[PDB]
Design an enzyme around this catalytic site. Structure first.
Site, short mmCIF file in Angstrom:
data_model
loop_
_atom_site.label_atom_id
_atom_site.label_comp_id
_atom_site.label_asym_id
_atom_site.label_seq_id
_atom_site.Cartn_x
_atom_site.Cartn_y
_atom_site.Cartn_z
N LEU A 22 26.38 -113.25 -24.70
CA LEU A 22 25.47 -114.24 -25.34
C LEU A 22 25.31 -113.93 -26.81
O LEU A 22 25.23 -114.90 -27.64
CB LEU A 22 24.14 -114.24 -24.61
CG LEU A 22 24.22 -114.68 -23.15
CD1 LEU A 22 22.91 -114.50 -22.43
CD2 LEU A 22 24.72 -116.10 -23.04
N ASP A 143 9.15 -107.57 -35.99
CA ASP A 143 10.53 -107.91 -36.24
C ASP A 143 10.78 -109.37 -35.88
O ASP A 143 11.78 -109.76 -35.29
CB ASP A 143 11.49 -106.89 -35.58
CG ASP A 143 12.93 -107.03 -36.01
OD1 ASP A 143 13.16 -107.55 -37.13
OD2 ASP A 143 13.76 -106.79 -35.11
C1 LIG Z 1 17.03 -108.92 -28.67
N1 LIG Z 1 16.78 -109.47 -27.35
C2 LIG Z 1 17.37 -110.53 -26.79
C3 LIG Z 1 16.80 -110.71 -25.55
C4 LIG Z 1 17.14 -111.82 -24.61
C5 LIG Z 1 16.40 -112.08 -23.45
C6 LIG Z 1 16.78 -113.15 -22.64
C7 LIG Z 1 17.89 -113.85 -23.04
O1 LIG Z 1 18.40 -114.97 -22.43
C8 LIG Z 1 19.39 -115.40 -23.25
C9 LIG Z 1 19.54 -114.62 -24.35
C10 LIG Z 1 20.46 -114.75 -25.50
C11 LIG Z 1 20.92 -116.00 -25.89
C12 LIG Z 1 21.68 -116.15 -27.03
C13 LIG Z 1 21.99 -115.05 -27.82
C14 LIG Z 1 21.52 -113.80 -27.43
O2 LIG Z 1 21.90 -112.68 -28.18
C15 LIG Z 1 20.98 -112.10 -29.03
C16 LIG Z 1 19.71 -112.63 -29.23
C17 LIG Z 1 18.86 -112.04 -30.14
C18 LIG Z 1 19.27 -110.94 -30.86
C19 LIG Z 1 20.53 -110.41 -30.66
C20 LIG Z 1 21.39 -110.98 -29.73
C21 LIG Z 1 20.75 -113.65 -26.30
C22 LIG Z 1 18.56 -113.55 -24.18
N2 LIG Z 1 18.20 -112.55 -24.99
C23 LIG Z 1 15.84 -109.68 -25.46
N3 LIG Z 1 15.83 -108.93 -26.55
#
Ligand SMILES: Cn1cc(-c2ccc3occ(-c4cccc(Oc5ccccc5)c4)c3n2)cn1
Length: 325
Positions: A22, A143
């Protein structure tokens, strides 16, 4: 390396089958998994780098999530739900409900076209309500940035149908009574009391939200810098001079000559700042009253003095939100 254990088809914790990546960040990556022990539900798993700084933040995040999710079991205040955590080949892995795209990825993949103002309003309200819940529970996020605001659903055709969000990433969140790191926030979202090492608390999140809302409105940051001095000079150009009381308190006296930033406006950097930055209200794309309402709220979020700065409880009452009510 994490690369060896995060591939499509890999099975974590004898139940989570990776189907896609993701996103990634400094901390590791987040993958979408099928959970074979929950009837095939798709979930998100954050795989944390096996590096002390990030392991420590993950352990902190797990404890904050346990608190927030227990306090708000319905997710009324839109903090992401953690389902469990485990270790895989020495990496901490945190399992979450599956959300949609980050607001950052959405805007980026659309070529940095800004969000529609109606969607900004709904998103801003939800961010304010969610982070206010942290604030109510002696927490500061520290953040906030578009990457950490995710759409709930994949409710887009990209053209957005429903703009509902949740807040993620509690690995930097800090309790009132806890050791406060000296440096917090991603630079472009970092409040002046952080930069000036004056002590910070919940108000630093409000500053970050103001910066997020500008970015949603324009498609770009009004603080396009990677340097603290230049950052302050941009603040001065957008918001006016910093208060004397903040300058007198800083141990960073270097930065100022008689309560003015020691800044050569005629230098290469000076000319850059004069071109890229101007008084906040000049960035408005319309003089329509709903745009003036947004900008009035952003100006109050970008108050220099953290005490005087609008609180999120107050922001939820601002006139910009009247169309929702
Ligand atoms: C930093 N962080 C992200 C989560 C989290 C919790 C539930 C999730 O359900 C979908 C996604 C997700 C969807 C698109 C991109 C993605 O990648 C990231 C997002 C934010 C910062 C770096 C990478 C994550 C997702 N991400 C918890 N902490």
């Amino acid at each position: 390396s994490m690369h060896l254990i995060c591939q499509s088809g890999d099975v974590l914790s004898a139940r989570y089958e990776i189907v896609d990546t993701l996103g990634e960040g400094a901390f590791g990556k987040v993958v979408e998994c099928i959970d074979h022990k929950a009837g095939g539900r798709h979930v998100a798993v954050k795989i944390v780098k096996n590096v002390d700084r990030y392991c420590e933040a993950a352990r902190s995040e797990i404890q904050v999530l346990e608190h927030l999710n227990t306090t708000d079991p319905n997710s009324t205040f839109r903090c992401v739900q953690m389902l469990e955590w485990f270790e895989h080949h020495g990496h901490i892995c945190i399992v979450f409900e599956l959300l949609g795209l980050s607001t950052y990825d959405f805007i980026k993949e659309n070529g940095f076209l800004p969000f529609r103002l109606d969607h900004i309003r709904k998103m801003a309200y939800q961010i304010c309500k969610s982070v206010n819940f942290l604030h109510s529970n002696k927490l500061t996020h520290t953040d906030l940035k578009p990457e950490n605001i995710l759409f709930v659903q994949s409710d887009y055709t990209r053209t957005l149908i429903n703009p509902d969000i949740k807040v993620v990433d509690f690995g930097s969140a800090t309790y009132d009574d806890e050791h406060h790191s000296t440096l917090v926030s991603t630079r472009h979202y970092r409040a002046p009391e952080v930069i000036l090492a004056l002590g910070w608390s919940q108000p630093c999140d409000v500053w970050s939200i103001g910066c997020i809302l500008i970015e949603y409105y324009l498609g770009f940051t009004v603080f396009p810098t990677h340097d603290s001095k230049e950052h302050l000079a941009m603040m001065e150009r957008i918001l006016g001079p910093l208060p004397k009381h903040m300058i007198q308190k800083t141990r960073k006296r270097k930065y100022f000559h008689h309560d003015r930033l020691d800044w050569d406006e005629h230098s290469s950097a000076g000319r850059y700042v004069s071109r890229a930055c101007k008084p906040l209200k000049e960035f408005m794309l319309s003089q329509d009253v709903e745009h003036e309402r947004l900008f009035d709220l952003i100006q109050k979020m970008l108050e220099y003095d953290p005490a005087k700065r609008i609180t999120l409880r107050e922001a939820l009452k601002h006139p910009f939100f009247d169309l929702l009510k």
